[PDB]
Amino acid sequence: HMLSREDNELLVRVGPGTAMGTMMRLYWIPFLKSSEVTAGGQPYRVRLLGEDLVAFRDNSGNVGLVDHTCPHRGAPMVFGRNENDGLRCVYHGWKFKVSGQCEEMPCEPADSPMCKRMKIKAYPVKERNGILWAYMGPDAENAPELPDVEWNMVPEEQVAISMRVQECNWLQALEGELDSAHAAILHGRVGEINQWRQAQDLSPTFECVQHDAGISIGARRKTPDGENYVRVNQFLMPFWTLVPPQSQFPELSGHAWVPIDDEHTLCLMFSYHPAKPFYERTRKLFKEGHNGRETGHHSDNAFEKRPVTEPYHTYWSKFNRGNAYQFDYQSQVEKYNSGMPGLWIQDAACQSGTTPILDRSKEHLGTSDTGVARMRRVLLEAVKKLVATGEHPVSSNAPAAFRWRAVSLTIPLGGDWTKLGEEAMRAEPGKDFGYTP
Amino acid sequence: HMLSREDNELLVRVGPGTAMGTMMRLYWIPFLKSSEVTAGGQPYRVRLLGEDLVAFRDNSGNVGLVDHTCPHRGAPMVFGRNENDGLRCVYHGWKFKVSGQCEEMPCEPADSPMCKRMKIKAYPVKERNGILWAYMGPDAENAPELPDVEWNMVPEEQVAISMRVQECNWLQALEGELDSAHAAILHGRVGEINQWRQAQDLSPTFECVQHDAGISIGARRKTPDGENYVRVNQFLMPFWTLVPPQSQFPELSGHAWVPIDDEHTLCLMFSYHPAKPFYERTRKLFKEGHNGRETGHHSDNAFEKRPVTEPYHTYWSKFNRGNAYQFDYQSQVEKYNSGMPGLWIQDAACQSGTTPILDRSKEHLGTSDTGVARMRRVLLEAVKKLVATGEHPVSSNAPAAFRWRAVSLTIPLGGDWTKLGEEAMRAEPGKDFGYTP
Amino acid sequence: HMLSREDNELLVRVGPGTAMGTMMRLYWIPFLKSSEVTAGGQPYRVRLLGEDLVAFRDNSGNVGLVDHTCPHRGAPMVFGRNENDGLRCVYHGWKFKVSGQCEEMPCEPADSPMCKRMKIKAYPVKERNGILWAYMGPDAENAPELPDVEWNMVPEEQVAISMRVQECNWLQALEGELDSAHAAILHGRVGEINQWRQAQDLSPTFECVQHDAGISIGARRKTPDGENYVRVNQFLMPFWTLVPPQSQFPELSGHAWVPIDDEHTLCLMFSYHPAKPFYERTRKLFKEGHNGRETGHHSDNAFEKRPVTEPYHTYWSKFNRGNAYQFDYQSQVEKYNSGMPGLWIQDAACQSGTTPILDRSKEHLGTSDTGVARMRRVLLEAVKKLVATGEHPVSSNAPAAFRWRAVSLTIPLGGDWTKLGEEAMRAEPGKDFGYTP
Ligand SMILES: N[C@@H](CCC(=O)O)C(=O)O
Ligand SMILES: N[C@@H](CCC(=O)O)C(=O)O
Ligand SMILES: N[C@@H](CCC(=O)O)C(=O)O
Ligand code: FES
Ligand code: FES
Ligand code: FES
Numbered sequence A, B, C: 001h002m003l004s005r006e007d008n009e010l011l012v013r014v015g016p017g018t019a020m021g022t023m024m025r026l027y028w029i030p031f032l033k034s035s036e037v038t039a040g041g042q043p044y045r046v047r048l049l050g051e052d053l054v055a056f057r058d059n060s061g062n063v064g065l066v067d068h069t070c071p072h073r074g075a076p077m078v079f080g081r082n083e084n085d086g087l088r089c090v091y092h093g094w095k096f097k098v099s100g101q102c103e104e105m106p107c108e109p110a111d112s113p114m115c116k117r118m119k120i121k122a123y124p125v126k127e128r129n130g131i132l133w134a135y136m137g138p139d140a141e142n143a144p145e146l147p148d149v150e151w152n153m154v155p156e157e158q159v160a161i162s163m164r165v166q167e168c169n170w171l172q173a174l175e176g177e178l179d180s181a182h183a184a185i186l187h188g189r190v191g192e193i194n195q196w197r198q199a200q201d202l203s204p205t206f207e208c209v210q211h212d213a214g215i216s217i218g219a220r221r222k223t224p225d226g227e228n229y230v231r232v233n234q235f236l237m238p239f240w241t242l243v244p245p246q247s248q249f250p251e252l253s254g255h256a257w258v259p260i261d262d263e264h265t266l267c268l269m270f271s272y273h274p275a276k277p278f279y280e281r282t283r284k285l286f287k288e289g290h291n292g293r294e295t296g297h298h299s300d301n302a303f304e305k306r307p308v309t310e311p312y313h314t315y316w317s318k319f320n321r322g323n324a325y326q327f328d329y330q331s332q333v334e335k336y337n338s339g340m341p342g343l344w345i346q347d348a349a350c351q352s353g354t355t356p357i358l359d360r361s362k363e364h365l366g367t368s369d370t371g372v373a374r375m376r377r378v379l380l381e382a383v384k385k386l387v388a389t390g391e392h393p394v395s396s397n398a399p400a401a402f403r404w405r406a407v408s409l410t411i412p413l414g415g416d417w418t419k420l421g422e423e424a425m426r427a428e429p430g431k432d433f434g435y436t437p
């Protein structure tokens, strides 16, 4: 469970040519909402796995993802003209299709073959249920299908999405969602029956079961009746977490914790009902805030302004390191265990720590980190095999391996959740929970 | 035409002791307007070729250029008292003349010889037609006269000047003014006869002729009548560009692209009539803006506020990297090929690229860069000889070599512009264009 | 007197494991006002000698000083809950006493021994006359008593305190207070009898006498009557300066110039009467400003806002590098030798120089720096012995060695101030000056 500086480096470094950056590049990356690029409209800057890029939707409705720098003499592609089914650099007129193929160089002789030989760096994009996905691996023609992540396979009326930039490395943010025991402590109310059933037993015991695409982490608690309440969080490779539903207005939430660069993470959150249209009231509260506080989702109107040249320029929060997440001491005294003004914010402020990259060689884990330690083991084993022998993880070529659900089961004391919950943990089209969360 | 990382380094690095910084130091540097330092008034911070300095005009009207740091115990010289024909550090009273010679140390015994031995680093300044020039080379007593650049030799009523800081390395900005084919593309209007004659032929062919002080770059276009329209841009060592005049209210513009440091450039722009007082209307539009947009010059009231301790503290634009040059997508859609709100801004946003120093080893040149490639050849050859054998460029000791003009000639198809334009490309006191631009 | 780059490095570097950082760690560090942490109230971030920490006062009134980072999984301790005589990280509930001992880990089994073995990095704090002191040395059980610095031993009604962050390395700020000749120059009025008696003789001669805890620096001036006026500034190890009193409303001022990190200094200033309650008018002017200008103390309401996560978040001035200390040229012309709007500000702007760490290998000292040079000699000798042989300075284990006062004596021409001022330079409980300042 104890990590060297070297192990820490293998996990946090995601830039081009790095171990973890190479392994991340074997998977499709969910990187933007469909709505963010309008056909023939403004391009949108992103940065993914350390690389600065520009997405645009052409007039025929197709999205390309290209270098942010023009390959001619280096002008910014975000200032290009998106029209006639291409993005054209305004400096000398080089025009690129969504594929990256250059289509015109107006300043060059018309006989010139330079144009047909020219490509801007570009990555294939797929689009599903309002989400754009990119494949950044070296062999696009050998890319598998999108992963069978249920949240992105249900009709859109069943799902609610948000995204935000968090100012820390991806893995310490991901860990925060495989950490069942934190929630009652960090997110609880001062003083006072209980508020969640997790509040009933503050020290779950842990059991973890590896499968082809990650690990199931069962947090086993005692119930005031001497049954077991098992919350099973799911990790799916390389950067997915699934959160076990609560009692009221039960839904399946989770994130892809997409590394923007070594210091920043795109926190793509989803909340879905597996079988019914999503709760209308919940949807609105995600978007507008709840009792004046952020939910687990980022609300729609609480982002700062950034220029178009910044990556994810519309996803930087008004709650950030530079203002200590608008921490409110008085509310910590009077009402909330933590004075951060919302659910995701409480998570972000803790997990982002006092520097953007956690040094795990300095940490001191307890039993509450059992699941965290086990998930790291999966990552490290995978990345090391990739470095040692060039072997890819099974899950990088197996879309059907992602058909998982987190579950919150009530079972006899000492029960085997892996058997009792076998069916409920299986994702299926339009199948309901199969139990009472 | 293909540059190594190493060649790129030789060109972009301008700090003390570097190859290009050594070669730049062989030439007089135009570095401030006369009006910027009033006799006995406030000193003004500058940084040139990587060095932080303070200019001041003493009570007798003479300008000195000295270290920004007091040589005693390091106090900032910009806070010194400019009076009694010296600048005096307020910490312990050391007073320096424009030459750098220390004149008084009030806290020292009056017998002490330390004072007469003490000099602050200082560089010789010359003043001509409202422009201050500095010589930063190691052997001031062997400095040639100022270069015979016509723009700075005409009476002031014939010339209009602006300066601005651009947040990129000097050479990529200079290149933008030896790049005839860019202009119709970057600076054109959406949709629609034509607007400039350059718009008639979007792919000039290129011919370049080296001379003692740089290179003449002839962009040859076709005319709708089967004559040739040749625009000859001029590069003069080490950092001058001359722009061929347009048809209406023809004038000769250009820049010295003065390296402030490796990441910043002082863009000193001049526009002159060679024989008549400058167009009054043009002058005002440079100063005030044109249809609410910047011209090629920076307007007088569109700079941000900076503290006196910053170099060129009054020349940082309100249009800058941090706000994406106030890019306006709607105007790009409706009216302008590029949505940057002015001529210089369109140039700056493209040429400054996505990082302050362009890596030319990553670029992909075409025929439109013929002149750019040829100018780099001149620079690289010069800097390499200087490194290899210590040989100075001819033009570093030949003021009369700078007597050039850019020209825009109409000539028979296939004509020899070098002969037909021989006289028009020669600068002479009060001589008119000698043709119709 | 001439320092190598290497000597400069030995003096300016104060982080963990460095020479000067090791030697500083042998002494108690005055680091906060008592009033800054209320019992059971908000914790307060500090950084000392390169280390980021959190101070808190528990419900029983005791102060702890702990790592700013939770030793579990790295959450910020400044967001912890200060209650029930501990500070508890909100992420997983780890609770720490003022000693650093962990008291609870709610998420762990109740049998678990991890808790009793766990400590957060913590340092012992002592409290005296409204000042909190920390011991950061490796052997706390062998720490001497607090130093017998009189300013912190008188009843509080005799003393006035301020603190501010200055954006430069500690030693160049400390030097400014062992530099008698600066004051009449930097702090004087334009044109015009005199204003201080230091203004009568602008070039004192210097004599220095080392003692166990530092050096006495006598600046000897001529009086308009042919007597001697000796101002004796005191340096006490490692970072104390004592300022000789003036004529009117004489008081003893000084600072501990506490290194926050290599680039920042906590300027803890004290002004006391040795025998009477402090002048009420003086006290108010320190707090409110004097004729609209800062005194030597920072006024109470001229700090910028910083988030709770910044060290010394309430001590960053509105007069700072980023705004050139609100320098006012017009006032420099009309009224003040230096246009900085106050006494400490004039000091700060000069001594902070043009970069945060002065490179002494580039300086050019004169006789006015005699005391500065001698104080450096004491520091360098001490730090070198510590590195060479592991020997600690005498003064690091001798509280009674700090019982010193600066003095401003009137004595016969050529007198021996060390004998004439022997008694006046001795600090004693409630003893008056023993002369007329
Ligand atoms: N995102 C949820 C996860 C809840 C859980 O792990 O049970 C939180 O931060 O509380
Ligand atoms: N400064 C002018 C140069 C014009 C030319 O090269 O012809 C521009 O940016 O358009
Ligand atoms: N802090 C005082 C010290 C005065 C002295 O050294 O005499 C000043 O800056 O002027
Ligand atoms: S820089 Fe993009 S076309 Fe020339
Ligand atoms: S620092 Fe300039 S005179 Fe002393
Ligand atoms: S990070 Fe502080 S208790 Fe877990």
Ligand SMILES: [Fe+2]
Pocket (backbone or CB within 6 Å): A176, A182, A183, A186, A187, A347
């Ligand atoms: Fe949480």
Ligand SMILES: [Fe+2]
Pocket (backbone or CB within 6 Å): B176, B182, B183, B186, B187, B347
């Ligand atoms: Fe241009």
Ligand SMILES: [Fe+2]
Pocket (backbone or CB within 6 Å): C176, C182, C183, C186, C187, C347
């Ligand atoms: Fe002073």
